[PDB]
Amino acid sequence: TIPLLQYAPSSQNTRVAGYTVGGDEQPFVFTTDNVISDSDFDVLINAAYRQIFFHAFKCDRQQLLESQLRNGQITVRDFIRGLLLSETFIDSFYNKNSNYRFVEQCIQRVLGRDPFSEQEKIAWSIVICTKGLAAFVDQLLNTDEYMENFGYDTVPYQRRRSLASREQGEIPFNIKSPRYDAYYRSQLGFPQVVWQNAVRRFRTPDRVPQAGDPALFLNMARSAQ
Amino acid sequence: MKTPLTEAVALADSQGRFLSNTELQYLYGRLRQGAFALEAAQTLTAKADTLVNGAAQAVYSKFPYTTSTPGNNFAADQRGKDKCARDIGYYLRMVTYCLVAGGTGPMDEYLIAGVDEINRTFDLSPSWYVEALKHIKANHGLTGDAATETNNYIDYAINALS
Amino acid sequence: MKTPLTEAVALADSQGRFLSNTELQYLYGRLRQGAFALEAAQTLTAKADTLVNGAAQAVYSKFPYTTSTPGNNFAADQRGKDKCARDIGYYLRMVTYCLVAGGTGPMDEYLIAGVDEINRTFDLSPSWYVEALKHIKANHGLTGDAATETNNYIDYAINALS
Amino acid sequence: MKTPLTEAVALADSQGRFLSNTELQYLYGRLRQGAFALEAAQTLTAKADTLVNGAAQAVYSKFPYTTSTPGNNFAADQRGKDKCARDIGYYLRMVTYCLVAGGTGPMDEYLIAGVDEINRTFDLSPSWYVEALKHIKANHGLTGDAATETNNYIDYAINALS
Amino acid sequence: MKTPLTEAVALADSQGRFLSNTELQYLYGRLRQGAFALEAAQTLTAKADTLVNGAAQAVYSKFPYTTSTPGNNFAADQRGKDKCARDIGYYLRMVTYCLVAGGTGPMDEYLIAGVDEINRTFDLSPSWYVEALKHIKANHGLTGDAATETNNYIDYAINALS
Amino acid sequence: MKTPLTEAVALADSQGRFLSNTELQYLYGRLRQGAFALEAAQTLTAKADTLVNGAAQAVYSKFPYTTSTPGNNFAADQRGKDKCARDIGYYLRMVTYCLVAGGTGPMDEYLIAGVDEINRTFDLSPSWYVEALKHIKANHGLTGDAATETNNYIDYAINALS
Amino acid sequence: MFDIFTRVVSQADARGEFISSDKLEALKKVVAEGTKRSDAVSRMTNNASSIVTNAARQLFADQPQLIAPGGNAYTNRRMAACLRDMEIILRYVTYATFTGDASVLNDRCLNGLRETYVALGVPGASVAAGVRAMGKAAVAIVMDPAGVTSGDCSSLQQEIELYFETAAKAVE
Amino acid sequence: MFDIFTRVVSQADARGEFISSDKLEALKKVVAEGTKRSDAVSRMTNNASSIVTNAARQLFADQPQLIAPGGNAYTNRRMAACLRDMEIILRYVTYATFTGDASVLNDRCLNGLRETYVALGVPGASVAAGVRAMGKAAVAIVMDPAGVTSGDCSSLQQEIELYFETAAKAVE
Amino acid sequence: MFDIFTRVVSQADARGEFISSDKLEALKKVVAEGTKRSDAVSRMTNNASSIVTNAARQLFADQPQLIAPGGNAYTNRRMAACLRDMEIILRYVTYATFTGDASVLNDRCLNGLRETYVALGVPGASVAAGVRAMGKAAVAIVMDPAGVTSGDCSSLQQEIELYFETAAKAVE
Ligand SMILES: CCC1=C(C)/C(=C/C2=NC(=C\c3[nH]c(/C=C4\NC(=O)[C@H](C)[C@H]4CC)c(C)c3CCC(=O)O)/C(CCC(=O)O)=C2C)NC1=O
Ligand SMILES: CCC1=C(C)/C(=C/C2=NC(=C\c3[nH]c(/C=C4\NC(=O)[C@H](C)[C@H]4CC)c(C)c3CCC(=O)O)/C(CCC(=O)O)=C2C)NC1=O
Ligand SMILES: CCC1=C(C)/C(=C/C2=NC(=C\c3[nH]c(/C=C4\NC(=O)[C@H](C)[C@H]4CC)c(C)c3CCC(=O)O)/C(CCC(=O)O)=C2C)NC1=O
Ligand SMILES: CCC1=C(C)/C(=C/C2=NC(=C\c3[nH]c(/C=C4\NC(=O)[C@H](C)[C@H]4CC)c(C)c3CCC(=O)O)/C(CCC(=O)O)=C2C)NC1=O
Ligand SMILES: CCC1=C(C)/C(=C/C2=NC(=C\c3[nH]c(/C=C4\NC(=O)[C@H](C)[C@H]4CC)c(C)c3CCC(=O)O)/C(CCC(=O)O)=C2C)NC1=O
Ligand SMILES: CCC1=C(C)/C(=C/C2=NC(=C\c3[nH]c(/C=C4\NC(=O)[C@H](C)[C@H]4CC)c(C)c3CCC(=O)O)/C(CCC(=O)O)=C2C)NC1=O
Ligand SMILES: CCC1=C(C)/C(=C/C2=NC(=C\c3[nH]c(/C=C4\NC(=O)[C@H](C)[C@H]4CC)c(C)c3CCC(=O)O)/C(CCC(=O)O)=C2C)NC1=O
Ligand SMILES: CCC1=C(C)/C(=C/C2=NC(=C\c3[nH]c(/C=C4\NC(=O)[C@H](C)[C@H]4CC)c(C)c3CCC(=O)O)/C(CCC(=O)O)=C2C)NC1=O
Ligand SMILES: CCC1=C(C)/C(=C/C2=NC(=C\c3[nH]c(/C=C4\NC(=O)[C@H](C)[C@H]4CC)c(C)c3CCC(=O)O)/C(CCC(=O)O)=C2C)NC1=O
Ligand SMILES: CCC1=C(C)/C(=C/C2=NC(=C\c3[nH]c(/C=C4\NC(=O)[C@H](C)[C@H]4CC)c(C)c3CCC(=O)O)/C(CCC(=O)O)=C2C)NC1=O
Ligand SMILES: CCC1=C(C)/C(=C/C2=NC(=C\c3[nH]c(/C=C4\NC(=O)[C@H](C)[C@H]4CC)c(C)c3CCC(=O)O)/C(CCC(=O)O)=C2C)NC1=O
């Protein structure tokens, strides 16, 4: 069928080479092949959850993918695919956002980079409505950038967020993009005002005692004999 | 958001296919459900106030250490029992919403997704709400088909809590 | 598997670089820890049996409805109290393992990862093990630095349970 | 950015947990390091000017074709030798920063990440800075614990260059 | 593996389409190249032995500290100069292979991918092979298309080395 | 967007390297192509109007049910035949653009990507445009280099349609 | 992501000469007070859960809308997410007083948090009141002495008040 | 991503009729001068490394801050990254004169580069001076004739000055 | 991935009672010798590059095929990849003596390495000779004492010989 629009790429910290070195701003990398103990599976599963769902609660966790991955038949790439097509991601991210903001969020969380331009999210928003969320996630995983940067056996991360000798590099994309936007919090109607200022009690205004007032000596008379 | 209609739309939507005959059946099968379901929601709305009061009675009679031992979580004083009336009223209202929508999605969205951390951090033993929902499912006195729907309904509530 | 040495190895493996000068300090800082830690593990091994018996005493005195009300979870009969001795002995032994390893990884691997579903499905209120660990951390009587390390230790246990 | 404290924070952030006994162990092990490290940084600051002059002497005596052959990279004239004083002063200052921070992260961030392309495109043979760092590690004269850090320290510099 | 034909096949495979008109033009443009390229490969095969001997002469005359200073990398004794004859013969042979294939792929596959670590770990300054390839470029004597092709060719070699 | 030059640029960009010797070879092979290609584009521009009229004649003579049967797709009345003149003029113009660019990319971008759904939904049998392109490739009377390229050219058109 | 040791390093590098003696007295007394600093952090994270529930319980006693229907923290996962956010802010302020610098706090969590809470519809002043009450309990937990040698932690009481204040003012 | 052949194609398609004769004289003389064009590109990329180091060596002789501490290109990886950027700009201007169109240059590298250098803190005028000096050396290696039969190169000396100028003005 | 502390933990857990006193004497003397252990690791990784080039230079002096054409390490990236593999084996044996256990070595790098070298066509005995010579130099960086306190390192020189031997025998 109809191919994608050709959108020109824009400059970013990713398409550039970069001379990376081992520091902490580099995300700890979680790979299926070397975790081989039972606890390190828990750390990897927690990290993939932190990326895809932002701290999934026990309701959001899928027993089948975690079980099957601890046995080792599942690849972590297939595990991320199963997370994206799972209903808690669809419910939290595909439902509440429009197609364009969903593609923005999904590119950030699968590929680990911001989309290059608005026309890229526009060009990728054809395929999700025409061919389904499964085909969108499948075509996203099959692209060569996800494969060269992470591969089969690596949980993705935000790639080259922070440059050397910077205080800040970049917003971590978990802070930057939450699941609501302004448009759907308007539907939920959340800014109901806290209204705890200027209540205007009607009781009579207190007047400071004038010089020579009897009360002025009340507080010392209470302390005296 | 689990109603049969939105899941039909999500299936057609995920697939990308147009609405079909398979989706259509759900709508007139939602007739087998809804023709009693709206009646049962109304009669639960009538039964509601005595249901929460009896459920509070059953929870206090099952666990006397709640009404005895002083604590923030326990209903020793008045305000704890007010929190209990609030919590069981929330549970009964989510049962009514779950009954009107046709699926567990309102109940699964408004109650179930955070109940594990709330029961962990705030020291609310879920067997209390087990007692409350079991007393409700014994006391509601639904008739025929509507009653059967609630059991599947209220058992899902207990299974999410347990 | 959280010990400081395996985390240094994991950091060096994830970065793909051999251990630096900073990595070396880690182990001679494990000297500030271990020079009391092995002593404290031995004295906990000596204190162990009276610790579990006193913790069972404190849990039964805090919650009399456990020893009163008949149930599978509650310690009404002998075999329930035997399960309690098993559970608190497991908790104390994981504290000793956590103390010898130097990090929370044995305790986090052997206890913490499944405790939420076990407390949900088997009706084990975690405030019971809160009482047990608080009684242990009051009763162990550790001296100096060893006592403080365990306290950060036992507070992590309560924070995982609460 | 490799100091032991920021790596402890990075480990706790990647796992999503709070600190443990290990963080305390890490920093009071940074006592085993820092109680000599700040002394050694001060005495290197005192030794610094004769260190760069002797290192320039050793590099010129090892490789006479630098002072002989006319070129932009070679120190034939004055301005080349000024560039050499700048380069070895930068190396010694990064050693001092690496010593004060406790880990290789300042040195690995300010020197190591681009040295391969700079030595490739600008025709700077790294064996020159090998000579310079070997002369520094022979000439600095730090007794006891300080010497071990430097060898561990300055050997990492040579291993990054070679 | 960069020849124009395999890149046409790789483009058609990645697009999953049948060969286009441009690919067909591609090979009769490989006629503009190859009709001199095979001649130039033969005359380089004839020129080869005096080319390596003159390149060794130029490298030894440019850098006398190689023939003077004793070392494993430096050609002080016989076996070092034998290694030099091997290295420059390898460079000239990769130039001949690169000329016969039509693209840089043999040269980029057999030389370029590891030259940075080999020059880093084994202390081989790449300006030596810069001298060698510049001396080779100067005296081949090829006339016309082959000469122009060689310059683009040998400049790519120097640009990979520098 | 398939011309040989943009595919050379795309290959060099995907490989992240400067344009090589092979890329240079391709454009002077675009000389073997273009030295006849621009001539053939001009003579097709001259031949164009009689080509579309003869192709409409051949399509109407091959399929008389188009000119007979009343329908929106069929050319029963005048406006259908006007649509036919538009469609075959579009096909001939894309052939001319494809000839001038050097690759199938203009034709593959402007015609081929949507032709399957248009022929499916609008009831346009592609064997009609098969007849039209076969009549064009028989009637154009191109010679030498232009003739061979066009057949490769117009056969690609029929292969995309069939 | 900056330790105060590498704060001195990066400032002396942007200057471009060696670390002066006055900064070395300061760093030596940093080393003599970092003992207080590091395990001040861990006693703050000792009762971190009870601190979080007490601050949230006070906040929902002060503002009854947030547990009223229609409020921001009303449904169960939104209330759990609010507890998650308060735990995260406490944990990052704990990291910041462990590094000894507010750079991790302003760098890791605070910066886009202002825009996130505005775009979600989340009230910011409620978070500000929560982090302020949480900070009061935080120093006092660390400040109060149970089974610890008496010492001057005034700087710790000082610097952790600064860190909680930067958190609350950057939430806004 | 546009060849000048498909520039004529896309303009004639947006017009919607065949390519006129005047554009065909122009394209024929493009074909007669593209010989000059393509290998003008490769002789520009012949000494591309020495061009890059000479332009950077001139730039850091003109602005001594960028190798002074506190400057933008001071530390070793930042200096290496600056060399990488200058090589990238030269390589893309080389692609642009190979395509014969500045569309690859404005499309592939220049557009977000302005915002990238502003958001990084990188000076833009220093890059502008670097690309201008690099372009002067570039034609004089393209422009000067060595081993090539002398022939008119006005379009080539001309068009590559235009491409370097668009690069420097779009960096700003 | 196993520290010797959690080796004792996992063995006592599979037993299922507390850690006995004899294992606690052993672990206390482990704590008294782990000082030697950890920075034995770092002095091994002090000259790790020169160790790697010396072992490879000896290996290609012993087997002239591997730099002869047709050999396994002949072309430039294959030779660089062989240096990468020898560095990786040294780094993992360094990790293994830092953990104090060969579990990281047998767990992280050795296991599929045998099948990888067989399926690639890589000789295994050449790697075995390389790791053996590398281990000899490795202890002696550690084994010889220069400008430092004398000690009973015989036990420890011991363990690194065991680790290099397991590496070479598991390559095969
Ligand atoms: C969709 C179908 C499906 C099944 C059935 C399945 C089983 C399955 N059971 C597992 C473990 C397990 N299975 C058991 C089983 C039992 N305990 C006992 O003592 C009894 C013999 C038995 C209870 C019947 C135990 C104890 C483990 C944990 C072993 C471990 O994780 O170390 C694991 C390893 C992952 C983990 O849970 O840690 C998988 C994948 N996975 C699937 O995807
Ligand atoms: C709409 C779905 C929904 C659920 C499930 C829910 C549970 C819930 N119950 C709460 C409190 C409570 N719930 C109870 C009720 C009980 N505790 C006991 O010990 C009794 C046995 C039981 C009475 C049946 C009490 C006593 C509190 C008070 C906690 C406190 O004051 O700190 C709170 C803390 C909020 C507050 O401070 O008012 C939540 C979020 N809230 C919801 O909005
Ligand atoms: C190594 C870490 C570890 C933990 C944490 C653990 C918890 C644990 N406690 C259990 C049972 C139990 N634990 C208790 C203990 C108590 N319940 C109460 O009501 C008392 C207040 C409290 C005494 C302190 C009791 C009574 C059971 C019995 C459940 C039954 O018989 O169905 C069971 C069911 C296994 C069995 O049937 O024997 C598990 C898995 N097991 C472990 O292996
Ligand atoms: C990671 C495991 C670990 C811990 C927990 C640890 C704590 C620790 N705190 C110490 C001191 C101290 N800790 C405090 C702390 C305080 N005093 C107050 O009155 C304040 C309220 C409070 C700070 C808010 C003080 C005042 C000292 C005095 C000694 C010193 O300056 O270190 C010391 C000095 C050495 C010793 O006590 O034997 C230790 C060991 N050391 C460790 O290795
Ligand atoms: C903070 C870490 C850091 C490092 C490592 C560094 C290396 C470095 N050394 C340079 C130049 C230089 N470095 C040297 C030094 C030497 N060359 C020789 O032949 C001598 C043997 C040796 C003296 C020891 C010389 C001569 C140049 C001049 C290059 C030129 O003028 O083109 C340049 C070019 C910058 C300029 O033009 O001033 C860099 C980036 N710069 C840094 O900022
Ligand atoms: C097919 C592509 C290819 C390249 C590029 C290549 C480089 C290469 N040159 C080497 C050695 C060498 N190459 C040289 C050559 C020189 N060194 C100098 O100082 C002179 C200036 C220069 C003479 C021009 C020398 C002296 C060695 C010896 C290193 C040693 O014996 O340790 C080695 C070590 C292998 C061995 O020990 O024989 C490699 C891999 N090998 C290849 O197979
Ligand atoms: C891709 C590999 C490749 C290259 C590099 C190549 C170049 C190339 N340039 C040529 C001609 C030429 N090239 C130039 C170029 C110039 N003269 C000047 O004075 C100007 C300054 C400069 C342009 C800026 C000229 C003037 C000619 C004359 C012949 C012709 O028109 O082609 C020719 C004609 C045939 C021949 O020389 O044998 C070749 C081969 N051919 C190839 O196959
Ligand atoms: C640039 C590439 C391009 C192609 C390929 C193209 C095909 C195309 N042909 C169309 C119509 C048509 N094309 C034809 C032509 C024919 N049908 C027959 O039955 C005859 C055998 C044949 C004459 C050769 C007719 C009759 C229609 C009319 C459909 C209608 O009026 O509903 C339409 C509908 C647009 C309209 O309503 O005017 C499209 C999109 N359009 C393009 O822009
Ligand atoms: C590392 C730093 C970091 C922070 C701080 C952060 C905040 C953050 N808070 C959120 C939600 C939330 N935040 C709150 C906040 C509160 N409830 C109230 O009523 C008060 C006004 C306030 C408590 C202080 C609530 C209720 C939500 C849930 C809104 C929703 O998810 O619909 C969300 C949306 C995702 C979700 O949890 O459902 C993010 C990303 N994320 C980060 O990565
Ligand atoms: C395809 C087109 C493209 C361009 C142009 C591009 C530029 C680009 N330049 C960068 C940095 C840089 N750019 C410079 C620039 C210079 N140094 C100076 O002093 C001068 C003002 C200027 C030299 C002209 C420096 C020093 C850095 C490193 C800053 C840093 O990484 O901290 C970075 C950050 C990543 C990094 O290299 O660390 C990008 C993405 N990326 C692209 O994808
Ligand atoms: C990470 C930075 C660091 C290093 C490098 C370090 C080394 C170090 N090695 C030590 C001791 C020692 N180190 C050795 C080592 C050996 N003696 C031999 O004859 C053997 C050949 C060799 C082992 C192969 C010995 C024998 C001692 C005696 C004291 C002790 O047992 O610690 C000590 C004891 C305290 C002191 O010397 O002041 C230090 C500091 N400490 C540090 O904080």
Side-chain angles (χ1 to χ4, degrees), chain A residues 27-129:
Chain A
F28 188 25
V29 62
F30 309 90
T31 58
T32 62
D33 54 3
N34 66 46
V35 283
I36 199 182
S37 77
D38 262 7
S39 179
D40 210 344
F41 288 117
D42 294 326
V43 175
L44 190 145
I45 283 161
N46 283 11
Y49 281 165
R50 283 184 69 209
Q51 187 179 9
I52 308 301
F53 306 146
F54 187 68
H55 180 70
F57 316 118
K58 188 258 303 168
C59 76
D60 289 331
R61 297 202 207 201
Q62 282 78 24
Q63 300 166 153
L64 296 167
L65 314 184
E66 296 181 41
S67 283
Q68 282 220 34
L69 181 51
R70 288 207 178 90
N71 177 227
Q73 298 158 166
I74 296 303
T75 316
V76 76
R77 154 176 163 156
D78 285 327
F79 170 65
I80 288 144
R81 161 182 288 154
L83 285 195
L84 297 157
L85 310 174
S86 177
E87 175 79 341
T88 178
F89 184 77
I90 299 189
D91 176 275
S92 282
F93 280 80
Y94 175 51
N95 187 354
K96 310 183 155 64
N97 301 283
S98 316
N99 288 34
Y100 312 101
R101 189 174 171 85
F102 179 75
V103 167
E104 177 149 28
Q105 176 80 260
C106 193
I107 283 182
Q108 284 188 22
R109 294 199 183 199
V110 178
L111 295 169
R113 64 156 175 105
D114 205 0
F116 286 129
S117 56
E118 47 193 57
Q119 309 167 34
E120 161 172 34
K121 326 189 269 178
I122 282 164
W124 277 80
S125 47
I126 277 143
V127 304
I128 172 172
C129 85

Side-chain angles (χ1 to χ4, degrees), chain C residues 24 28, chain D residues 32 145 148-149, chain I residues 35-36 39 142-143 149-151 153:
Chain C
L24 271 300
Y28 300 72
Chain D
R32 153 84 276 184
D145 312 351
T148 56
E149 252 59 340
Chain I
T35 204
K36 299 185 179 182
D39 185 23
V142 43
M143 211 37 44
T149 314
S150 71
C153 191

Side-chain angles (χ1 to χ4, degrees), chain F residues 5, chain H residues 2-4 37 94-103 159 163:
Chain F
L5 307 187
Chain H
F2 262 96
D3 198 353
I4 59 190
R37 168 178 314 281
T94 281
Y95 291 172
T97 172
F98 182 66
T99 331
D101 194 14
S103 145
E159 215 184 36
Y163 291 149

Side-chain angles (χ1 to χ4, degrees), chain G residues 13-16, chain H residues 69-70 74-75:
Chain G
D13 196 9
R15 288 183 172 191
Chain H
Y74 149 67
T75 67

Side-chain angles (χ1 to χ4, degrees), chain F residues 61-79:
Chain F
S61 313
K62 198 52 167 285
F63 307 105
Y65 68 99
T66 7
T67 82
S68 171
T69 284
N72 308 343
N73 47 355
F74 308 120
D77 37 41
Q78 166 83 10
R79 66 108 186 170

